């Protein structure tokens, strides 16, 4: 599950990469910016513990830190606005499909946003519940309800629909993130069949700036 790291200027950030490699020998780092291409940036050898920069990169900008066995991290220093993008993590493994040819397996990515404003404190998403119209259930015996989120930063977000009983996420419909006065807003909706009108159903969001670091919980009362 992709994440998001947000930091100001003249500061440092930590990017963690989550592969599960046993007989690891090398760990290559990358970067994929918008409109550009994914390009390698350095790499690191497990046995000798040394950083091998690329041509043109100033020393003292990228560090790899191992905090326990088979655990790796990349640390960035002196952040400028050109640092932002998506960062990966690779090793040559043969491999996840267990084949004979060395193919570079990739991580999952992390978005880094370098800001300068730090204006408003609470930039956590603010829910709003739209109660379905009972007239809709009269014709086709189906209810549709809309979940609206507003005032969040950055634009990385997640939406799920639960039923409070099982760990199965219901298939639903999704909008599009739209920018409203330097902050984003989004919504999604789900349809309930007639057979589950009396059952309660749930919707959770996953955002970097959630309160207490835990997923926000939205509880929808059953339709009467």
């Amino acid at each position: 599950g992709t994440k998001s790291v947000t930091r100001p200027t003249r500061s440092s950030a930590e990017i963690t990469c989550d592969l599960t490699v046993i007989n690891a020998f090398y760990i290559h780092w990358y970067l994929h910016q918008e409109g550009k291409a994914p390009q390698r940036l350095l790499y690191y050898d497990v046995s000798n513990s040394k950083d091998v920069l690329e041509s043109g990169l100033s020393p003292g900008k990228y560090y790899t830190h191992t905090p326990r066995r088979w655990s790796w991290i990349l640390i960035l220093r002196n952040l400028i606005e050109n640092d932002s993008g998506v960062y990966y993590c690779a090793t040559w493994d043969r491999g996840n499909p267990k084949t004979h040819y060395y193919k570079k397996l990739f991580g999952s990515g992390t978005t880094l946003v370098v800001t300068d404003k730090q204006l408003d404190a609470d930039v956590s998403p603010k829910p709003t519940i739209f109660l379905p119209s009972i007239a809709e259930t009269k014709l086709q015996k189906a209810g549709t309800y809309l979940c609206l989120l507003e005032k969040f930063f950055p634009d990385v977000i997640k939406i799920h629909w639960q039923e409070k009983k099982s760990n199965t996420i219901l298939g639903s419909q999704e909008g599009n993130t739209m920018k409203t006065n330097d902050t984003y807003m989004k919504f999604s909706w789900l349809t309930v069949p007639e057979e589950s009108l009396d059952k309660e159903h749930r919707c959770i969001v996953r955002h970097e700036n959630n309160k207490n670091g835990v997923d926000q919980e939205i509880i929808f009362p059953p339709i009467k």
């Binding site: 193919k103 109660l131 809309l146």
Partner: protein, 202 residues
């Protein structure tokens, strides 16, 4: 070295086949060809590998032909699917034989899969509200060229609803907004040269 991907957006109907172009200028003797895949959640998946002295690659629905003269590689998918809409990449292994190498990538050829032909269907229009903001839901319609106007006195903000594809086969839409006179607001929907209101459903 250099890798080129000229296309920037493609769209093909369901159950057809596509083809993407990759031209590479190299100066080595042995190399390997890799095609990749990225989902809109920023996740990179290995797709297929060609090889230098190997025959034409074929792994399931993925078929690749290789030209060693002009150094051109073409990727073709046999059967399309709605979840196949993802950027595809061309990666060059130099020389592709050690565990200290790197890769060079193209720029990406995004594909989009659109639903096939379906019969015309009448939109059903509903309205729900909360507080000040109101939104009128629009059920299935086909064409996708539906313009919705909300009749009211004081306007605050408008938004472009949706072009979302439902899994039955017909698109859906949800238009948002807020109005000062939130007591009773309806929206007018016109599709296939005919206009359907919202109050006629009750």
């Amino acid at each position: 070295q250099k890798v080129t991907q000229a296309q920037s957006s493609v769209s093909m109907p369901v159950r057809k086949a596509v083809t993407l172009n990759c031209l590479y200028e190299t100066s080595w003797w042995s190399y390997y060809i890799f095609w990749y895949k990225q989902l809109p959640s920023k996740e990179m998946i290995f797709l297929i590998r060609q090889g230098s002295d190997e025959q034409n690659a074929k792994s399931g629905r993925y078929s690749v032909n290789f030209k060693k003269a002009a150094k051109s590689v073409a990727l073709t998918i046999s059967a399309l699917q709605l979840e196949d809409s993802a950027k595809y990449f061309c990666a060059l292994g130099d020389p592709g034989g050690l565990n200290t190498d790197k890769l060079i990538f193209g720029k990406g050829t995004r594909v989009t899969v659109e639903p096939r032909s379906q019969p015309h269907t009448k939109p059903s229009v509903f309205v729900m509200k909360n507080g000040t903001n109101v939104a009128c839901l629009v059920k299935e319609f086909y064409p996708k060229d539906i313009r919705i106007n909300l009749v009211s006195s004081k306007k605050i903000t408008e938004f472009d609803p949706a072009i979302v594809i439902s899994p039955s086969g017909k698109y859906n839409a949800v238009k948002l907004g807020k109005y000062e006179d939130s007591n009773s607001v309806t929206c007018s929907v016109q599709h296939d040269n005919k206009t359907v209101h919202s109050t006629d459903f009750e």
